Amino acid sequence: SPQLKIDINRAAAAAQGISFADIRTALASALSSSYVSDFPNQGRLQRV
Amino acid sequence: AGATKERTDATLAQVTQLAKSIPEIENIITVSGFSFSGSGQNMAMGFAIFKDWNERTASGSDAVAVAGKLTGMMMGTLKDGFGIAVVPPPILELGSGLSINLQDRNNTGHTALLAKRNELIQKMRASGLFDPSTVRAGGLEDSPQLKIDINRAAAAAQGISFADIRTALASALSSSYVSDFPNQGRLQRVMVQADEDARMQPADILNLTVPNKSGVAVPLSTIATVSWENGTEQSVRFNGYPSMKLSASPATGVSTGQAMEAVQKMVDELGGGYSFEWGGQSSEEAKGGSQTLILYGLAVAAVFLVLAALYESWSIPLAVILVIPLGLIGAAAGVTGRNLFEGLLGSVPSFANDIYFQVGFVTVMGLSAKNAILIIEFAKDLQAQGKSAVEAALEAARLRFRPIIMTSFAFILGVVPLYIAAGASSASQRAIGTTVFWGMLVGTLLSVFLVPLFYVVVRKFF
Amino acid sequence: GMSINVLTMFAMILVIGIVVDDAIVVVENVERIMAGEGLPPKEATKKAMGQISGAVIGITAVLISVFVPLAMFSGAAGNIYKQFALTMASSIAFSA
Amino acid sequence: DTDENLAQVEVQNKLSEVLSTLPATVQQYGVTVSKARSNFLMIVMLSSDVQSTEEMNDYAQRNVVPELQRIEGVGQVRLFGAQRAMRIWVDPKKLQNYNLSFADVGSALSAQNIQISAGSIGSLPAVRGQTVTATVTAQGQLGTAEEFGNVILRANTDGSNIYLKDVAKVGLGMEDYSSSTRLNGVNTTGMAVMLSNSGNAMATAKAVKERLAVLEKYFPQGMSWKTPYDTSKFVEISIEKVIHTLIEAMVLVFVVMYLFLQNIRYTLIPTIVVPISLLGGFAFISYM
Amino acid sequence: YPGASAQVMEGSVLSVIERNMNGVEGLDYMSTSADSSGSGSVSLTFTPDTDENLAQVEVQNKLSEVLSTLPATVQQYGVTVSKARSNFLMIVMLSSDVQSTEEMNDYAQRNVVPELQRIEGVGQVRLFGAQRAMRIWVDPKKLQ
Amino acid sequence: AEEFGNVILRANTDGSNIYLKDVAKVGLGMEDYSSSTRLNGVNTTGMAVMLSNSGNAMATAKAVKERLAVLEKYFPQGMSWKTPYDTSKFVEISIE
């Protein structure tokens, strides 16, 4: 399959950029959701 | 409810006093914090161990008698506590257990499920199908709890994150495990908990100052409300569903069949989306008594076959399996006859159709078959020589009389030590003592006269 | 592999008569013959074994037959039943 | 040489040694070990009118784990879909509007939605002559979508609060949205039971269909259960085939013998021999 | 879970395990007991055919898969799995004059785990009390 | 406990230190304070041994009472061990 490839030069991260960790949090939580905690639903701990 | 270790050890102190007022009891071990029902400050249980069996030989020294005497003493003198002494079951558990588990199979409130629990309990007490007494909700207690309402409006205005509130309440009330420290060559725990003077006043709860975001210490009084409500001290989830244990029994007077039958209909009555199930104890394995017609089914089939195998016909086995009720009336009249005897003087007659009666009866049914096998086998030889049925039967009975008496009365006498047996496991030793003794005596007697008749009846028909 | 249960001893205490039963049946019959046929200890026993051997086989097989199905139960009462039945079934088998 | 008991748990052994080095997202999710025959025994199609696919999947998880995993034979039940979760759909444009981000909303829920345990009044150790011991309750857990929308992402100085109600569409959704099950076109949600390595086909399928029969009594009505896929019916056909065929062969064998021996007395015995001799084999079958 | 009341204990800890506990082989029935003592239990009674070896560790299997989602306090504490007959064989009363209950409980833990758990037959020894810890009793008023 | 009391909660700028000795009562206690065991009234502390599913009653209890016999040799003296509860004595009665 045709995929997208995000090239990230560390020169930009060093100049004005952000740590790779925050970039991971951004892409992951914006595309494939993020499991944050558990919540009580109708007598059963489900996912948020 | 709302009990503490002080009041509990006070009740336990009274228990130890009453137990040491009983000469049968050698040592007593009181333990606060635990009971069969559950755990907590209100829960406690004691083990009153006795003196040797040899000394406790008088009417009123049996484990059940001291149990009754101690319970009576407590119910009369024990202040601030419900205390009862019970006797341990012989085998299976190692009281009469009756575990219903009323589960809600719909997501309705716990209050509604326990209201329906009490509904099931009440309607089962009112009904005769679930024979009265033995009615008690198993589990634990309902207790008055504090309820801290925290509006997030306060947390948003000047308040703190919920996490810090959690750290505050948890570490100030139920201690906090922080790290490990080397103690005398062993890594032990270090725990931080607020002083007794703080975490014990109901109003003091709000007085704890949570660290605000700006390094400010703010009391819960500004952001929280304490509500003195009620709540459970034990949440039971049976088979994935939140359930409740309730008791009701049909014992020593009524079969459990009708009660266990009507109860499903009972659970059906309320909600319809509610269900129940069964747990239990030794009394559930006591139920294994209606598997009997398969026992005797296999029994008389095995005897009839082996008889038809050795003796090589079908008349003789019928002449023997005819003798099996003769030992039954002897065993039954022996149990009934001793239930008659013990009930007149000073004891409570406690013999019944237990496993010892059953295994003892199986023996008796074997020996009676042996006897019948003996005389009818010889009369079988005698019918061959043209000797008439009444003739062959009589000469057989005449020739086998002495050995039959010699064997049986050696055995009947042999179980007399079991018949008069006392002490430990005496209830069992006498149970199998009575059913075997009288079952074999009356068995032998009725057999020795009716078996020569059995040949004559059978052979003159076959 | 069964640890000795109480009921097993009950058997052997109840059974103790039945193991003597065959010894008694034989010893009584030779005694009858030692008075009836009344011949020297060897010849009298020959007449004994000749008339009573199959009669002893009867007693054995019928006790063996009636005692085995007590074992075919599974469970708590099943365990206890199977124990008592097996120890008997052994004892009678060795008495036979 | 089948010994799934020793192998499945030696697998769990190595995986218990492994779970730590695995990504934090995966470790939070959890990696499962299963001795699974990949074959499908039967599917249980749940079709309803009042309910929806999402809603049925929530009660499916209510009758499938307590009941359909307990049943003997079945070592795995695969639900087609996912149990429902609190789905929060943020809009990245409203995020850059308030100078916010995904890290803010994540931390917001990680803070304003936590399980808080307090303690007890007059717990041990207690002062002398203390009277009452009572636990205290506090709820730091959001239950509804509205409460999740009113969570603070940022508190302004003037008293204004940035909510998740503003930056996100919050509500109950599913954990995943991939699997789509359909019976004859209509949107149904079925459960697939598979056999453990000690699994039967007739006894197991019998058990699950008569267990779900009683389970339906406690359903939120409008909920029906159909079992189109079923390999137990193929087995029932086999026992029907053995009865019919043995009858055909037995009647046949009798005929040739009666046609040769020419009398019912002669011919009645060998047809009485065959059930006895085959029952003997049957005994040996159960023994092995 | 030291602070957990009955409902918090049942829901945040005990109910999490149970949802993974009937994938266990030969699971006859299961119950759960959550109380206000900060303790929680879930019992899995199996079908009569005894094989505690395969079952106890399939229980540990599911619990090893579970421990992470459990509260940080509970996970730090540790959740134990045991094939336990609830019946008491015998008690060993340790009585001393120089020593106290706290002090005996520290040496009790010195002769009970190395020695009284090694012994054949015994699969569990329950000590009445607790081994000693470094207890720190802060005063909230001196805190503010 | 002294070293735990001299831990710094906050260091002031003038050189003053806030200790745990000031804000807390530090010492050796127990992990829990719930269970209270008493033999005949006096404060004793007993250990309850339970059987594994392959557990005996006579052999096991024999083993633990004669193991604790040698264990006592290395006790800090003044320490005695009593076994009031014992189901092995019931078994001994059976073989008697």
Residue numbers in the entry:
A (entry chain A): 721 to 768
B (entry chain A): 577 to 670, 673 to 1040
C (entry chain A): 385 to 480
D (entry chain A): 97 to 384
E (entry chain A): 49 to 192
F (entry chain A): 241 to 336
Quote from the publication:
The best characterized and most clinically important efflux system in N. gonorrhoeae is the MtrCDE tripartite multidrug efflux system, which belongs to the hydrophobic and amphiphilic efflux resistance-nodulation-cell division (HAE-RND) family. The membrane fusion protein MtrC, containing 412 amino acids, bridges MtrD and MtrE to form the tripartite efflux complex MtrCDE. This powerful efflux complex spans the entire cell envelope of N. gonorrhoeae and mediates the export of hydrophobic antimicrobial agents, such as antibiotics, nonionic detergents, antibacterial peptides, bile salts and gonadal steroidal hormones.
For the MtrCDE tripartite efflux system, MtrD is a large proton-motive-force (PMF)-dependent inner membrane HAE-RND efflux pump composed of 1,067 amino acids. It appears that the opening and closing of the MtrE channel may be induced by the change in conformation of the MtrC membrane fusion protein, which propagates the progressive motion of the MtrD multidrug efflux pump within the transport cycle to the MtrE channel. As MtrD is a PMF-dependent pump, this may imply that active proton translocation within the MtrD inner membrane efflux pump provides the energy to open and close the MtrE outer membrane channel.
